[PDB]
Amino acid sequence: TTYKAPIERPEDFLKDKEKAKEWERKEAERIEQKLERSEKEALESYKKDSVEISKYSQTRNYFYDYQIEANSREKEYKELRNAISKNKIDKPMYVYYFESPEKFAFNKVIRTENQNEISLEKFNEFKETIQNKLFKQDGFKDISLYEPGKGDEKPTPLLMHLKLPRNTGMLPYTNTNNVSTLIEQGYSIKIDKIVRIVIDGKHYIKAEASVVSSLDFKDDVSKGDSWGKANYNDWSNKLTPNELADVNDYMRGGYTAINNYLISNGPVNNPNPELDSKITNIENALKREPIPTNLTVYRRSGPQEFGLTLTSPEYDFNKLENIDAFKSKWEGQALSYPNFIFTSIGSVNMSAFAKRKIVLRITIPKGSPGAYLSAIPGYAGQYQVLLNHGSKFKINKIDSYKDGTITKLIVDATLIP
């Protein structure tokens, strides 16, 4: 019933370092026979410039499609992505790695380098920060296959114990006097439980984490449009002639009137029965074929969405002070939208929003109201998913990147049911 792996291994090697490194070394040799010349060369370049290449793979998808094509770092990325994608795992693998608590927007110190005990106050504070949240992990990363011990490098007070699902690309490889295992990440994680462990006389927080399956097309708008059409090609017929007419009017210009009406508290301090009817029909059309799976969508936000303007001194993210302030005000907070939200299945930059500094990366839970509007023919909108009005987004983490000379932000948010 079950596939017989070429080299047998448990799901979790636990603290057994010998079984783990032995398996890792045999699989590194076995996988070497499957690789192309270009893929081995990519692995050699990775051994020399691991930091720049991993950094590139984290934010490469936020650029224009032609910029991604022209980027000299793209070929190395593609080869190293394919090298990993060749070895998709046959069954789950629990992996270990140290993380900075800052990756989960925890700004306090759990314990210092010299310290040995973690207070229950700091542990409960950390638990409150990571509970009921999904965090996006992205880019090339080396991980360990066993729980770190006394003779191992343990750079932080935080040990991640992550379960990688079946079919995750996982590449053990022989380095320069060591064996390592490389992954591409590119998933949402949830920290199910945090425990206080002790390794060589010091306390560490061990966070039991799992991958929460999600569809993330990133720069692959072709694969994303194929999904949207396979799921929403028949959507317009599921609607009443009036719901379809109000979706088309909204989609093709009526959004300006309706959105301003909702944003200016119109339904309360100036009701428009004609506009209220349109809103009700569009809301009901989004409840007809709910989002069928967890889906990551991207929105290039205007500064107005975060109470800013193009001339606000706080909208200058090239100043580390302004990045710190935006994160202080928003990380861990809820973002509420009175209007319907236009989002894309693709992360790429577009000429209509070229200068927009805040990229809102929304994970949409399965069953949420929403629809792939781009399945309706004759629509100018590129790879769009519309979300319901009055939606709330929990911001989990905010990151930054250089778009040429302009620093921009990536707000990793979850749609709240």
Residues 358 and 403 in one domain: yes
Residues 128 and 262 in one domain: no
Same domain, 220 and 357: yes
Q: Exposed/middle/buried for 118, CB within 10 Å: 0-12, 13-18, 19+?
A: buried
* CA distances, 294 to each of 14, 131, 216, 362 (Å): 30, 19, 9, 10
The parent domain of residue 8 ranges over: 1-215
Boundary (domain end) residue, out of 200, 215, 230: 215
Residues 265 and 384 in one domain: yes
In our burial notation (b when 16+ CB lie closer than 10 A, e otherwise), range 204-227 reads bbbbebbbbebbbbbbebeebbeb
Q: Are 146 and 108 spatial neighbours (Cβ–Cβ below 8 Å)?
A: no
Q: 253 and 297 in one domain?
A: yes
Instruction: Show Cβ contacts of residue 241 under 8 Å, excluding neighbours closer than 6 positions.
Output: none
- The residue count of the chain comes to 417
From 215, 247, 280, the end of a domain falls on: 215
Q: Please give the DSSP secondary-structure letter assigned to residue 313.
A: G
Asked if 62 contacts 361 with a C-beta cutoff of 8 angstroms, the reply is no
**243 and 320 within one domain:** yes
Residues whose CB falls within 8 Å of the CB of residue 407, separated by 6 or more in sequence, listed in order: 317, 318, 323, 357, 400, 401
Domain check: are 191 and 257 in the same one?
Answer: no
Task: Count structural domains, the chain.
Answer: 2
DSSP reduced 3-state for 68: helix
- Where among 215, 236, 263 does a domain terminate? 215
Given resolution (angstroms): 2.4
138 and 228 part of one domain: no
Q: Are residues 285 and 416 in the same domain?
A: yes
Helix (H) or strand (E) holding 255: helix 255-263
Tell me: do 231 and 196 sit in the same domain.
Answer: no
Closest among 379, 388, 303 to 343, alpha carbons compared: 388
How far the first Cα of the chain sits from its last, in Å, is: 38
Mapping DSSP onto H, E and C, the string for 147-181 reads CCCCCCCCCCCEEEEEEECCCCECEEEECCCCEEE
Do 167 and 304 belong together in one domain?
A: no
Q: Are residues 234 and 268 in the same domain?
A: yes
